[model samples]
Target: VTTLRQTDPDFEQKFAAFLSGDVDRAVREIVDRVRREGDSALLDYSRRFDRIDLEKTGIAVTEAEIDAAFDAAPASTVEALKLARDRIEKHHARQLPKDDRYTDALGVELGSRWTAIEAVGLYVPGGTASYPSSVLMNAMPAKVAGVDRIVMVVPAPDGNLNPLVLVAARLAGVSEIYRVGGAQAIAALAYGTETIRPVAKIVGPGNAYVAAAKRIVFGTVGIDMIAGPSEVLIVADKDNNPDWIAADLLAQAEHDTAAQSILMTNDEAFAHAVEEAVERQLHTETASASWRDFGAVILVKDFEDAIPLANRIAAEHLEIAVADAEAFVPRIRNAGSIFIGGYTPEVIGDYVGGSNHVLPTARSARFSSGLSVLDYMKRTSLLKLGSEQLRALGPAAIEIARAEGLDAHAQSVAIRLNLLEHHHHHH
Candidate 1:
């Protein structure tokens, strides 16, 4: 792990340097074929990529299979899925958009009307990469948003499906599911197939090919932000438990080799203690490589100095473990999500904490947000003007239209005002 001290003269240079998709053509071909051949192309790509013949196994996941998944999944596991689903639903339910329709002083009505997207396609990566929690995280918000059709597409390599994934989908209110994935599945979701109807938007995570396909089909359908490797930055004081801090960093580190974990602490001794604990906790090669490569320990002379550093990091997940964690929260301007105080670990937010785990990664926390019900809904601007309001505003509109050299625009408003004036004169 890289170590930096605030006192270092070259710290700015080191920190600035530390701050750091192809397959588009091949995916373009796959999307085009799927758009053209429909299910047949999906069948072919499934056979080639996943080694599953969709024609023989059938592309759609049936009710019987879903029921069997529930049966096969352990009761405790099923209950856990339910618990997560309920919490996610509860949290996202609060995010439902309210219609704001009101009139201005000029008597012209203008507002925003919120509506849920009718359909959304959720892509769940197949094999060991698939997590039941991710299933709930993606679908539960759409369910809470009142989305009518929540379709799920997952690759079943060798025709083997994760029972927990299926169970989570059902619990999260996924309407339809198919055992097809990759760029072809994205294509089917964007452009309809015989079995899978097209969706208005797509959400969830995938591999490079899936990301590329999403990029290609963007205008045809809306897509959630393309996610980057996960990361976490923790600001802790010397009073905190070093092991706990180390485990928190390693938790994010274990997500992927590219995932980053960082520590910003006031005490140098505490930083060393945490670093040692991270080494002792190295149980997996993935976590080991990630921590060794991308992880960092920043030493600040004062606790208050860490605040600006934390905001600059803009990590996907930020944990404030200082004694005054609550006080530091408001000052934090950039972070996908914040876990305040010593009691709150980032893992709780990942599972039973009711907040979404699908957070913005890299430095995108500066501009984007975690997945929520709002992602599944759209706001339409509402505007209505009566004849009186139009007449009052028409001269400026006519003047602007004439100034812009659009005679038709000017004439339309001028003619209406003239007629109103004439009618008034007659009366």
Candidate 2:
């Protein structure tokens, strides 16, 4: 039922290979084409990959189209988009930072104030699939952050945009949507083009080539993060239903061939039951072939072993389905998002869960965080001091400046000190 080795020597090598694959190179070539040829590159890639003939003039979506999409969208879908937007907005609104100004003992007022970015590009992937949920997840936070302009881009597989995506954008307060995608779309966002204006930052999910393009244009423009395959690590015990655990694993497995779904548990028998349940469910439901090949089952030595290993993996979505889910929450050191107990699943967070579903992947959780209002806003420190405050802190500043052996730094402080002294004497 389970394979247990002291350590798989090939695990690291295989993981490295998985992480370092075509993303970088594919993004580089796509970015190179965009940089050198501009709109022509975007059109060519669209024709080659998506099999749609795109013209520069027709690449950007218009206000009329957005209105038409909203008018034609199913009443139920439009209502669903609005509900998702409201929930996402409420959640991110709680995370917004408050502006503050505080004065120190030396009379120096030092604090930071938040301001939203002027413009941003939100990429909603539409070729293979359409995620109206993603539109709400990406744009709602920017709106909460008070971003000035929200530009959008999504590829039309048949030279036509998905009405749901456009409808969601309008509901989320995004005005500008483009009909371009892949590397060329990212390049247009980063470098600007005759048709598309460059954005201050780009955020959203995409295929491998899109992820790669984001990486290549990082310095020229800011990107959320380069994401990898979808992953979920479930720590479950006998207390959880085998049917539910199996269903959850399959849900993540359906994401892609490389998507990693794992079960870490102390109960060997429970692991087998879950596996059996998965087989039963697979038989009943039609799923992609990749699910059976890439999905995994791991029987850890004990619950104690499972906890640390889960932390080590730092999966994008983690489910704790043990007897006491809250008790184990303290033990979790790293994960993008944690769903506790039997009532919660990753799908809830993906759709109506009221949490921004954009999360970090590929072990980036060790250093980064998921998208939120904080991603679209920047903070600037404000420093203001009266003459008394400047005089009081001058000696410490001069001492540190002199210690650093930079005469200009010391001179700058001396100049401020001289001005203060002159004002005092004149008074």
Candidate 3:
């Protein structure tokens, strides 16, 4: 594991690279081919990248199959999925903006009209991991935003599908299901095929190729974010339990060998305690290689010193385990999600905390936000005016138009104002 003092040279340089590769040209070529070939290209790519030969099973998943999968899934797992869906739905429901408008002194009626995107495509990673939780996180917000359809795409190579994923998709009110995945699946979702129509936006998590695919189809269809490696930054004091801190670090590390796990501590003795615990746990830890490569134990003078560095990191997940964790909440300027107490583990938010787990990764929390109902909706400006209001506002606009050397814009306002004035004179 990397070790660095707060006063060390190249402090920020020690941070791991979230997006270190060059996959743009490769993904662009895949997207271009899929644009030309359509579903046939998707089928061909399933063979090339996934070796699944999707033509054998057909691309779309049947409703009968989705229901059957629910029955096939463990009853306890389905109940858990339903519980998460309910929590996510409730959280996003509260995000619905109130219909608001107020007349200005000029008597102009102006406001914002909110409307959900017509449809959205959700990408769920398959193969090594089966993320049923992803379905609830991505689709629940879209459903709560009043989106008409939630189309799901998962890579199910060789017809090996995850029952929990399918059942969760149905529970989340997804209207369509397709068994395609990767860049080709993303291509099919962006451009219409005989089998699949285009969607307004795409969300959820995937690997590097899928990430590249989203980048390629950005203008064609909206994307949630270009996510990177996951990360968790923990700020703790002498009062925290070492074992608990170590487990949290390993939890983040196991996500991917590239995922970052960092600890900032005021007490040197406590830092050693946590490091010893991490070493003891590393015997059976699934991500030992990862912790060795990307993890770090940062020694800081005090909690005050930790705050500025924490904001600068803008970690995807953050846990404040020091005393007065709540007080630290207001000081935290960045972090996709924050767990404020020693008992409140970051994993709670991942499962049933009612907050979204589809968070911004790397340092993206510095400028962007996690998935939410707002992501699935768009705003349109509303303006309506009577003759009096228009007359009050027209002269400046005409003056500005004439100054901009646009005669037609000036004429539009001038003609309407002249008619209003003549009509008033006659009256």
Candidate 4:
């Protein structure tokens, strides 16, 4: 491992090129084909890309399959699922909004009411690895929001679904699971297939094709966010343990080659020590190949530079391993989620920490948020005006409507005024 300052002149150029890469275009093409051709095209692409073949009828996972999966899953894994579900449920339950109404001096009442979306779709990545954690993260929020129906899609290579994934979904209260995945699963969830009903929103992390599909189908149906590569920025000082810092970076790096694991520190000596620790750990452990190539140790001049730079990256996950992590928490305006102090690792939030794991990535945290109870609910405003209130507001409404050149709007106000006058005359 080597250490470098991000202030190096070539840093900006390299970062810019990274941002303008061609991966999005390729993902869009896969998504477009799935949307246009449906299952036939999806099957062809899956066979070509994943080396898996599926008949049209066998594309969706069945109830019998799920039951079998549950039976086959280990008891320990099932218990873990139950514990994760409880923590996730408890956390999101607190996020439920309160309903209240307010009345103005004019007797006009206006307020908002919250209602859950009818259904939701969860995409669980399946292939080389199975993500039972994703099932809990995606389904629990929707369940807490009171979604009536929840469906899931996972790419089952060799036409086999992971028993752990199935057991996790069942424990999380999601019964509708499908075997289809990649861009096709997204298309099916978005557009609806003969076997799979369309969902109001689709969520979960996926490969480039899945991300691309979500991007293309966004407006047609709701999507969480087109997450970029997983990123973890660890900001530490001299008091931190090098071993702990190296472990945290490697945890994120194991996710994928594209995943970004960075360490920003003010102490050059501490940075060197952490790099040595990382190398020692890498030699002892079976580190993910991606980790070896992409993990970085970034040395900053001081805490002031480190803090602002971390904010600018707005990483999906940020770990504050410094002595005063809480003090710096306030200064962080951007980030999908923050793990404070050495005891609080980012992995805890991914599982038993009770926070939603589906976070905005690729600098999206600068403007967006992690998926939560709010994502599954819709808000509508209500307005009610009494006769006297309408009379007092009529002139302004008519004037504004006329100024806007909307005659229909002005005529409606005039008609209301005339009706009020007629009622007065009759009385």
Candidate 5:
């Protein structure tokens, strides 16, 4: 683990190492093959990578399978999923865009209209790590935004799909689900196949190949930001429990070996206690590797020093466990999402907290925002002009058009105004 005191002269240089690619060619070939060969390519890739046969299993999941998934999933898990779905739907319903129409002082009418994207695709990772929570997080926003069709794509290794994923999809209003993944799934969503039709946009996290394919399909279809590994930064004081802080840090670290977790505290003794607790509580090799490589304990002379450092880190998840955590929130501007006080933990936000877990990772929180209903909708600006309003606005428009040397643009307005002038005289 890299431990640094803020007072160190080379701290910035040391920290730079913690913040810092060959799968692209394979991804390109897969994407191109899927685009050209369509369903056959998906079938081939499914057999090659996931060891599943699409021809026999079929691309689209049937209603019977979905019903069976609900039956197969434990009652308690389904109840939890329903709870998460309700909370997510309620929270995102408030984020639905409002339409506005207003007339300016110049009698010019303008309007802003919000429209939901007709179709969207959600990619769920397959295998042992499949998360039902992700299905709710990605699909519920589209449902709340009034999207016409929500399609889900997931890989079914050995012809086995995650039952809970289907259950979550059903709960979240997913209209269709396909058992396909990786660059081929992305290609299918962008270009379409004989079976699966294309979507307007795709959203969800995936492996490197998926990330590369999303990059290649940008103009063909819209996509959410490429996500990085998870990360968390906790700002704590001596009052917080060392064990709780360590568990929170491990929560992020356990996501992936590249995931990061850091603790910033004013007391050196508390920092040591937390570090010891982290080592003592280590159970998984993934979390251990992540902490060994990316975990850090940052020592600061005062809590005030932690603010600017936290902004620079721009953590995906920030937990504040100080005495008055609420008071420090206003000073935090760059976190993707903040978990306030000792009671709040980052994992809660990942599950039933009603906030989206698909946050901007790395330092991207500095510029981008977490996923919300806005991602599922677009705005169209409207303008209207009557004869009098056009007359009031004609000269300025013509002058600018002429100044830009677009004679056709100038003539269109000039001719109309001139005819109006003549018609007025005759009247």
Candidate 6:
């Protein structure tokens, strides 16, 4: 782990490059081919990129396949998925907004209603970082939001599928499952093809091409966000255990080579202790090199100073392992999720904490938000004005339209008022 003081020179320049990477050009080529060729393009990309002939096997995973997967998976893991699903469902149930309307003193009636998207496409990653937990995270919220159809796409490379993933999708009641993946799958979800139907929105974290594809498809379809590598910023004090702090950092580090983990503390000695502990913990970890490459230990002037720096990083996951961790939450304005106290590790949010783990990364938490039930729904502003109310509102509306040089809009309001007055006079 790199150690630096707040006074270190060239710190900003060195950290800026590690924060972003671009793979849009390659992703664009894949999306265009998929748009033009549809199923054939998906097959070609599946064969070329994933090294699997999807033509021979098939593109969609069937209900029977998921049933078999449940049987194949250990009963214990299946139960865990069930618990996670129930917790997530319970937590997100509160996120559903109520419809509202009331007439103001001006006699104008205005209201808003929330409605679920007709369909949603969920992209679940495969391989080392793949977790059955992700399917629950992405699907349950959509389900809770009352989405009609919850479609899923997970890459089944070399015909090896994670039974746990299949079981989780089954438990969440996902509507459709596809064996396709990457930018091509995203294209299929955006533009309907022969097999996979297009959806109202897309949600999930993916590789660089998948992230790029999500960005490319933003207008064609409502997407969650362009997620980056996983990251965590831990604020600790001498009261915390260095070994536990090091493990928390490694958890984010194991996500990807670009994943970042940082430890902040006022005590220089405690920071060094965490550094030593991180080295010791790396011996048994899979992503040791990632920790070495992107991880850092910063010695701050005080715990108060660490707050601004943590907010600046806008970490995807933040653990307040410092003294009086609960009191520090409101002070934190930017993290996607904040885990309070020494006992609450960031890992709880990853699994059974009942919070959506699909969070903003690459400092995006500063502007964006973590995925939730809100992403699966749309809001429509409804307006209803009686003749009297229209008459009362017309003058201001016409004034604004005429001020903006929209003569047609201004005339439309003027004509409506004239018709109402003419009708009233005739009556």
Identify the leading candidate in terms of lDDT.
5
Of the candidates numbered 2 and 3, which has the greater lDDT value?
A: 3
Whole-model lDDT values for every prediction: 0.90, 0.82, 0.86, 0.82, 0.92, 0.86
Q: What is the lDDT of residue 95 in candidate 2?
A: 95
In candidate 5, what are the lDDT values of residues 258-341, reduced to their tens digit? 999999999999988998899899953888999988889898998889999999889999999888788889998999999988
In candidate 1, stretches whose alpha carbon ends up further than 4 angstroms from where it belongs are 423-427
Candidate 2 RMSD to the correct structure = 3.5
In the predicted model 1, the residue pairs found to clash are: none
Pairs in steric clash, model 3: none
For candidate 4, the C-alpha RMSD (Å) to the true structure equals 3.2
Off by over 4 Å in 3: 8-21, 284-286, 423-427
Off by over 4 Å in 2: 5-41, 285-290, 419-427
What's the C-alpha lDDT at position 127 in model 3? 74
Candidate 2 lDDT, 1-427, residue by residue in tens = 2343214666546444433434677678778878877888888888887778776448878888788988898898888778888888898899999999998887799998999998999988885577788888999999999999999999887776778888888888886888888888999999987778899999987877888788778888889987777788898888889999999988988777777787877777888898889888887821345456556666666577676667777888999998868888888878999998998989899888778778888787767788999999999999998878878787788899899898898887788898779667654
User: Using alpha carbons, what is the TM-score of model 5?
Assistant: 0.96
lDDT ranking, high to low? 5, 1, 6, 3, 2, 4
TM-score on alpha carbons, each prediction: 0.97, 0.89, 0.94, 0.89, 0.96, 0.94
TM-score of 1: 0.97
The residue ranges of model 5 lying beyond 4 angstroms of the native Cα positions read 423-427
Q: Write the per-residue lDDT of candidate 1 for residues 1-427, one digit (tens) a residue.
A: 7998888999988888888506888999999999999888899999999999887889989999999999998889999889888888888888888999998999999999888999999999999888889999999999999899999999999999999999999999998999999999999999999989999999987889999999989999999988688889999999999999999998888789999999998898999999889988885378889999899999998877887888889989999998867888898889999998877889999999989989998798989999999999999998898888887799899999999999999999988898888655644
Q: Which candidate do you rate higher for TM-score, 2 or 3? A: 3
